[model samples]
Target chain A: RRNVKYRRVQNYLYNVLERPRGWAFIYHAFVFLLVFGCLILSVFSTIPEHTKLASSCLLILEFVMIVVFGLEFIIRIWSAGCCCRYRGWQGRLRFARKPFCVIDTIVLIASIAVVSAKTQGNIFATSALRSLRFLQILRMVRMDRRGGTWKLLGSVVYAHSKELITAWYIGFLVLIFSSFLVYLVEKDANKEFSTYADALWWGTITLTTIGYGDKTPLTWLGRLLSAGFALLGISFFALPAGILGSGFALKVQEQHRQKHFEKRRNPAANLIQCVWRSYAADTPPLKTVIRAIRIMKFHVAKRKFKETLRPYDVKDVIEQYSAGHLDMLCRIKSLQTRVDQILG
Target chain B: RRNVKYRRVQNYLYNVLERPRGWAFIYHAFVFLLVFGCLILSVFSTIPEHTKLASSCLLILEFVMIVVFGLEFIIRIWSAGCCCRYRGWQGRLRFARKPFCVIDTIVLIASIAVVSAKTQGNIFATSALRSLRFLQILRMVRMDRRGGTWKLLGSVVYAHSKELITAWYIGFLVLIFSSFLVYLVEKDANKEFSTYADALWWGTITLTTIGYGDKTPLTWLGRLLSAGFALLGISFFALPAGILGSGFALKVQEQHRQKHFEKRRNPAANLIQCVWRSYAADTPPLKTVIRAIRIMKFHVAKRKFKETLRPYDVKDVIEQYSAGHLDMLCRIKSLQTRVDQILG
Candidate 1:
């Protein structure tokens, strides 16, 4: 009887999640509207619900956002990494000191600071008169928002300042050699490159292909040299651009992967289980979490793979797992026709 | 038959996309890597090769990129509104004129200005070197990369300068208010605030939260007032951060969206097609290039988006757009999840 009840509850919970993720989309759009729109009108400042109605609304919103942020902050700290890796309150403080952490802290402190904000003529009637409160977003970005791409882009971003420094050096060396050659050849007749230094500057510009044309290399040899420098300049830009783009993408992906990993590791399972047990008498133990987890992984991964790939090869895998959206899996077969058309 | 051939080409292209989106991912990744990694081994005055090897590579790369850029520049000038809003070459010069643009141009030109930059003991090598070039990722952080999130940060930096300038104005005002009160209340205790302006500096630091305990109001009312101003300090700081963050975020997003919209426009498509055809076909169709106005716009938008966004959200978006590792829909769905969690 107990087992049966648990099964019934489990089934019910599963049914709820089976629907399309439509609510989330609307919710984000709402926020983008709410948060961004509020600023334009000074959020609640314009309302006249009652005495100081605008102020009341503004304060209320600030408080609500504060509560939400506070809760998120607490939860993240509570659930951070494994038990051994946990730093408790100290860890939270350390995290808060980070760039994004400061943003989060600023937000938390903004409201509290409003009443104390003694800037005689200015103030937040409802919330902090200033947005130092929003600065906490920096912390949120690093902590709560940073996803899988942390590894990829972070590392590259981490390396970028350092690497570009070195690359510039190489770029300049090429510029200099080319400039000297041009200077020797054209310094006499070319007003644009009147002296060795001017020729050098022109060489550097041409090498980088900036070619200000304030000074073009006049001699045939100089022009030829300029052509070479220009090409190098192009590479100087292209190579770095391509690298930065790739690193940025990698970091983004790394952050994405991190979110997935964190969710799975922590498994909002506690929340899910809490909601589940409230409805069901017999709560499955923690080990069963692996089953739910495996299913979730398969479902999300398969869906992604099939959508982007040739449906046929993936069709077999989807059927084999039958772990994800069955209807979507079925459609994968039909998509094969389109896939084949493209592949050929 | 001609239609069929065109269809075949479309099919061929789509097929090449495969399920991985590897090419797209790779392209961005390359950008990231180049920006971060290219300069790792390079520096000013480090060029050993004077001509043959260095000169050839430099010239070739510069010529190709510039030809491509020049073509892009011309196309933008030709039909910028249809693609880049008529700023292609003109705007490049304009952007180049912006402080950051000047920084960008300077970094590239500095290298070219140095003669025999690769050669040891070159004096010009050190003259143009600035650390900002090594931190070139700043450009990526602009609205040109991925999203406008990072612009908030850039705005923060620029805003700081503005605020620093005006911070004193507000601080000075608060100082006067506090000083008047202090002078009125504690004139018998001390002669420090007898003059309005003299007491203003003390109040300015306290109200701004710089808190120099050197000057104190001995009277009870003065102490209480000081406490109040101290509290106001928090809000004062919060105000500019919020203002700057909001404005900067909006500006970058608007620019990114504009660029993205341009890229998706048919004119841009035509431009890319023209550029591709120029290389593929012996007879280049210059007329087809009207769309390719902001060839770099797409890159700029995407790059800015990636670099400017907080690490967390940046990663989330990458997860959303990831192709090779997961289901195509899953990546997007994951992004949706983030939008829900953060924005919602």
Candidate 2:
């Protein structure tokens, strides 16, 4: 009963209060904009300001955005009641069993700490942990498909998580082998690796294409491992993603085309087939013979095209009689070229 | 006659000569990377005497890439008849019609010029202009649906080009007005905007968010304008792009989701019938049925709690059930409290 109440309010808010009539699109759009603004301001607030005024502006914007978000949170909780979304008290305690809810709580708590964290004297870096909230786009994708390709990419990730995980483990094993090999070879070349661990880090980074460039292998053997791993990385990364993307794209294209075709096609039986089947049940062969004209024409045209010998300037007579047949001159040239190619 | 002949040439060049078999994806990717490399090297070449060897290495690379490109162009002309793409005496006029042809000519001309030009003047900032010529990804997009989102986004830009121009004009107007206002008030007290024109440029810079910090007004009115403009800049910059982006996001999402849903759905009449009827005839119906089911379940659970009526007696047999149900009861109590508070 409580779940029913919670749902009703949410429905009313989204379906009715969001817009008076057909404009629910506006409500969602406005909320999205507000969310984006709050997000951007939160990010900029952490950046150190050269001026006292800029810092103060950042501080004020931070507090205001948080207050708006807090009000939103409280309202939702009230609306959720004993609902699964809010899990009031023990219900929320039960919500602890749900992974999405756990993620939600983590994100919400992190956001608060980021904004309100006591200044630890690192103004140069910024306290705006909003970068972590970049992952919030993931949540938005789940909510609205029309708003994101982020959601589409996520669907693929979820669909192929198992294969991808297997691929990941395989890559990890390769990395471990490559690292050890490089450590063995480049440890002697202090000019490059200097240490086994450094060599390992360089091997890992270069192989993945991150190429931080903090360290590079100066030796010939190190370069070979780097080159080999780079090739291996492309094989592992490019192949699966490409193959998966290809199957997914074809599936998407073919299905869409079929759907469009189905909507346009009409269903009806041919007259001859209807009569022929009916006649066959009664041992009637005369109805099948009713289409005798086609049988005669097929034999007639087959001989003319396949075994034609009396053809002297047939084009002149055709041009005088049939405009469509007059185009035979053009087609004959193409056919002659095709036949020559085939014979050669 | 001339126009048709030129078109035939263009068709021949674009269809037959521009790519090697179907490896244009690979070929164009190389051209794009080479062009990008040249631009970066030219930018770095401006730095005072740092990494002279690296600069020379990049220049040599640029030379080799252009030589390969020039050979490809010459070979294409030889096979297809050089007049096909460049028809007649006016090479530049006809060549500009297609991007790849434009690229083939320019890269051939420019790299040679760069080799000669860099010896006398700077490596050349003109390379940035060359970056615009690499149409590999654009061509790839012209070939497939992978490019549709970009094309749609391009459509939005095309549609709202005038509005964007207006916004830009308005931006300049506001800047001038604010600067003139600042100059009127702060001219005697401070020397930041020594003349109205200088102050106008400063204001224009700030309003559009290019703030150079070389000039600033010290007066209170100027500071107010600065604050107003910063806030204004957010909305001003966002307005056209946001409107266009929002529309594009929605349009692409609808088309993409429809394609995805159609792919996974069963081809049986049952699924198709259900999917089609549920969505507006304009959209993929299968996705709609799922959304409907979600909404239905969401509401059924919502209204049950608002009346504060126990649909099921929880306290009567608390120990009889699992821990999950017990947790649900605690939530109902909190909801009841909220309802009572609202009534009060």
Candidate 3:
């Protein structure tokens, strides 16, 4: 009975901590808010003017965060054992060795060290450890589920890594050569260009089109070069922008194609899933079946009409359909073909 | 005899000015160089410390540019008579009213005004007129030939205009809200946030990630906000870059598809053009015909083999072929079909 209760507790914790549904959502939201609060506290505490009362309040908040995060980490480790792979002590140890677990461990250790160092009057050590606590921001990456912008961006970057790197390389070369040229031309005339490092700083500022106005060309030739450099900078930056923009568009298109292909490839699987979902929702089976059949017949008629037209004309008709409607039409066509096979 | 001479001169000038072959190439290169020189001269002459000799040299260069550009304009107007649409004085007037011609006229008028103003010792008027001379930069648009980066960029921008505008709108909103928030937070503690305009300037710099260090937040809340704003700025700027990058990629892909479609649509036209070129270059007709036949046979066999495979397998095979080879294969298939029709 005790073992059964323990297993049940483990399963419940797993659902609340790991799953996207039910209590897990509330857990995730609370964790997200706490993480943001921790970040704000870490950043704002660097200011030198907080009173004793303010400091005490901040310390209490910090302590609360530590307790909450510590409890969550322990629960995650314990609940991980609910899975077959992590059932034993050795398996639990393996679970703790995972990347996210390692990050959690580091965050906990850093937070504890910071608090301990503060009490020990080691201000330098405490400040350094406090910086380490900022690593908690990495925890946010865990929230990146399917269809998240972060996941999409990752794919986009990976797909066009070569083009992006090439753009960066070109921009870097421009920065180096332009800075060298400007340094050579303006060194004697302008005190701002006294060092090569200063020229590099100016070049970076100019190349990014920041124009801090801290360092500027005073000589005629240098000013002329600066004008040319500024124009070059605009196009240089635009290269990466164009690459990324096109990359994202292509990636999304490719994803849509993959999804459509998958749906077409497994019409029976789609029908089964939809039927199960409808039954689970207590929807009328006859009505759902009738609607699906109607859609399939409509799509079959549409396809027959499309086949009678020229390829160009067919394409024009396809272009007029919305993505959602087109997807449904494709699904209906696949279902119709499957039905014909069965009836035959 | 006089009419023949006039026609010859007009035709020669038209070739040199408008065509991209022979002397026209050299004229374009010279114009490109001259444009750069003009830009440099205009930008550099603003420096305060040039000697009289330097001033005379700049003035002479400016005068030479005016003369060359003026002569080119006149020649272009005269050469307009070579075309049926621009044959008479009235037609020439219509040609002169074209966008490029209008820009050319503005540049000349601005240049002349700047020189006259300088001679009359009206420094203020000369300064204003000199700014107008910068419009000559628009002349560079004419050099955007087919396959040029400028033309490609134009198409990319046009194709992704909606996405780009949406991104810009979001960034603008973020800028406004973040600046307003920072102003409200930092107004009491920091002098840099003393005015709303100052906050806006700071916001712009931060949003661009320039961080000139001219203005910085001193209060804790302001600093925390700045950090968040900086991160937001990075993603905001990346929006356009991603859009443009992907846009360029897609646009280029689309252009290649269009070119391939055109070639496939007119195999007989392609064959006729290639044969004419081959004959003009004094190539062996039998050798060209034999090679074409061999390519057609190879492609026919390849297509037959591909047809035996499943759809996915055929796609994999197609993916292995280089774009150039694929184009050649497509052309060969179309040519083979055309040959069959003729032989039948």
* lDDT digits (tens) for residues A1-344 of candidate 1: 99577556544433322221556345335444545533543534444553365555555665665566576555444444223333567765665465554665565676456534633435353244645434433432443244645765565544554334434544655665676678778867876665455666565555443444567654557645554455444434333454465446544554575444332323344445544553443236664675566556655555554454432232244344444445554565456444445444
Task: Evaluate residue B93 in candidate 1 and report its C-alpha lDDT on the 0 to 100 scale.
Answer: 61
Model 1's alpha-carbon lDDT is 0.48
Global lDDT scores for all candidate models: 0.48, 0.52, 0.69
Q: What does candidate 3's lDDT look like per residue over A284-326, in tens digits?
A: 8887786676566555545555553332322233344435445
Please tell me which model should have the higher TM-score, number 1 or number 3.
Answer: 3
lDDT of 3 by residue, B1-344 (tens): 99999899899888888665755777887887787676555544544453355456657777887899899889888898898798888999999988778877887887777677767857687567555656666666455443255455556568888987888788778888888989999999988788887787777666766566767899889989988977886578557666666565765444433443222324444445555555554458887786676566555545555553332332443553455356545655655555566567
Structural similarity to truth (TM-score) of each candidate: 0.26, 0.32, 0.41
CAPRI verdict on model 2? Answer: incorrect
Between candidates 1 and 3, the DockQ winner: 3
Worst 10 residues of 2 chain B by lDDT: B308-317
Candidate rank order under lDDT:
3, 2, 1
B64 in model 3: Cα distance from truth in Å?
50
Q: Judge candidate 3 at residue B101 and give its lDDT.
A: 80
Per-residue lDDT of B3 in model 3: 91
lDDT of 3 at B81: 88
Cα lDDT for residue A113, model 3?
79
